Ligand binder design. Structure first.
Ligand SMILES: CO[C@H]1CCCC[C@@H](c2ccccc2)OC(=O)[C@@H](C)[C@@]2(O)O[C@H]([C@@H](C)[C@H](O)[C@H]2OC)[C@@H](C)/C=C/[C@H]1OC
Length: 496
């Protein structure tokens, strides 16, 4: 029944009839592949629901010579495209100044970067803002305040959120508005400038521990120390790899689970949690199997993790979608790990159990629309689809519940994407991107067992094909293990 569907004539009427302040009808996508297809597809569906016009919000995509040559699907999907230099991403998708120049010349009113590339570079929203261009993500001020790993951990401690023992343990900031910030003098105290103090901090932290360079990433500038004897060599190896960068130390995550809490915030300080996900099964800094919601931790503890994630977001003035990752231990304790100031490729797991269109939520949020005025958010909280009545996310009268269970798996064998459909289960969707390479499969079920079963069946179907006639066999064995099937806490060995 569609009789109660409310629609407007255009983006302008939507913004005015929904308490927004900025009209966005043209968006520049600084990304390709599945990210670009996903972004356009999600928002277009929303445009159909709100304007009965799938193309009400036009899209412009950045295209490299390579992508255009392989006639990537995302290109044809866009209303317009702008050819850009090829080569590494620093010459295109991750080039902050290039993205901005394009956004202004078209011009568009907003930019979406997705994940990867420049999506976590605070200078992007910073430069966009200075040019009157909205960003479908957190503001630079929100990333400057949350800062890196050092800053955010310090911030977490200030809000009294448990953290792992590190060279910054105990540091806190002094804490109406005005987001929290970390003084440079406080920050430096969390870094180690030399082997000598590095050895003193490592003694109290205890081994094994990680020596990390904040400016480092993607397996770069990281090193694991097992003893005070190897510390010096390792510490200096990090200096050599990423010279001139601040360095901190952190206790190594023993046998813990990794839980993430999905966050969504508006431009008025409101924020809500969209349950969370479990990404414990990893293979050397790589999410292999993910579940939603998370169920390994008791609901009351997990709700506490949600409360901490929201306080952390509000205090720094976060805006848009984001993820707070926690470490859950065998006992029952948890510690803040980090906060991903952007959407991740696995956000659909959350979209499915919360029936929330994340990309469309991002777009409306950047238009100035308050959380309580988002249809999906109102329904999640059991309110009227089009009501204007504010919602108490703290103590709601209609406890929001997650619908079903989701299992996502990374599969392995540019901008070209291949949609995978299975004759087995109509409740599974997938894709993969040729260089071949990787992709992801997503499975839904009324409960965890049916979600796992649907996944196993679709994966068995993939094995039949040539490309994945072996590489997906380890996932099927993993998914059908007793320990996984029984949803046990001790499954760190599934990593092998
Ligand atoms: C690249 O586009 C793919 C992406 C599929 C992603 C996985 C899939 C899924 C999740 C879990 C298990 C199985 C399948 O998620 C979904 O279908 C749901 C959650 C969702 O993403 O659908 C999209 C939006 C309405 C919205 O963003 C969200 O709805 C709330 C629509 C536009 C479908 C897009 C697809 O196009 C065919």
């Amino acid at each position: 029944d569609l009789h109660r569907d409310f629609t407007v004539a255009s983006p302008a009427e939507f913004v005015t009839r929904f308490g927004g302040d900025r009209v966005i009808e043209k968006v520049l996508i600084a990304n390709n592949g599945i990210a670009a297809v996903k972004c356009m597809r999600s928002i277009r569906r929303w445009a159909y629901e709100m304007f009965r016009n799938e193309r009400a919000i036009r899209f412009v995509v950045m295209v490299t010579p390579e992508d255009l040559k392989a006639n990537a699907e995302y290109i044809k999907m866009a209303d317009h495209y702008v050819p850009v230099p090829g080569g590494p991403n620093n010459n295109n998708y991750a080039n902050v100044e290039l993205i901005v120049d394009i956004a202004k010349r078209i011009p568009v009113q907003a930019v979406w970067a997705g994940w990867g590339h420049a999506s976590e570079n605070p200078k992007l929203p910073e430069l966009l803002c200075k040019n009157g261009v909205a960003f479908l993500g957190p503001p630079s001020e929100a990333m400057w305040a949350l800062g890196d790993k050092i800053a955010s951990t310090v911030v977490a401690q200030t809000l009294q959120v448990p953290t792992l023992p590190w060279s910054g343990s105990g540091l806190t900031v002094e804490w109406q508005g005005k987001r929290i910030s970390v003084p440079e003098d406080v920050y430096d105290k969390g870094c180690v400038k030399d082997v000598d103090e590095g050895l003193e901090a490592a003694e109290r932290i205890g081994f094994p521990l990680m020596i990390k360079a904040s400016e480092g990433g993607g397996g770069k500038g990281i090193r694991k120390a097992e003893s005070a004897e190897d510390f010096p060599i390792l510490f200096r190896q990090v200096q050599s790899e990423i010279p001139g960068s601040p360095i901190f130390l952190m206790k190594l995550a023993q046998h813990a689970r990794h839980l993430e809490v999905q966050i969504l915030a508006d431009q008025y300080g409101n924020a809500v949690s969209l349950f969370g996900r479990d990404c414990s099964i990893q293979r050397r800094h790589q999410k292999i199997v993910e579940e939603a919601p998370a169920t390994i931790a008791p609901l009351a503890i997990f709700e506490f993790m949600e409360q901490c994630a929201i306080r952390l977001a509000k205090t720094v003035g976060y805006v848009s979608a984001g993820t707070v990752e926690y470490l859950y231990s065998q006992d029952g304790s948890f510690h803040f790990l980090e906060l991903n100031p952007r959407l991740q490729v696995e956000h659909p797991c959350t979209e499915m159990i919360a029936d929330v269109n994340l990309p469309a939520a991002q777009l409306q949020i950047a238009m100035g629309v308050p959380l309580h005025r988002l249809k999906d958010i109102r329904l999640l909280y059991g309110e009227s689809p089009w009501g204007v009545t504010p919602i108490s996310f703290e103590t709601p009268s209609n406890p929001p519940l997650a619908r079903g269970h989701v299992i996502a798996a990374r599969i392995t064998s540019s901008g070209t994407v291949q949609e995978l459909n299975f004759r087995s289960s109509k409740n599974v969707w997938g894709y993969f991107s040729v260089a071949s390479q990787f992709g992801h499969c997503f499975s839904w079920g009324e409960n965890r067992e049916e979600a796992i079963s649907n996944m196993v069946v679709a994966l068995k179907e993939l094995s039949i094909r040539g490309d994945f006639r072996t590489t997906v066999e380890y996932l099927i064995n993993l998914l059908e293990t007793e320990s996984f099937q029984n949803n046990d806490i001790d499954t760190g060995w599934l990593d092998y």
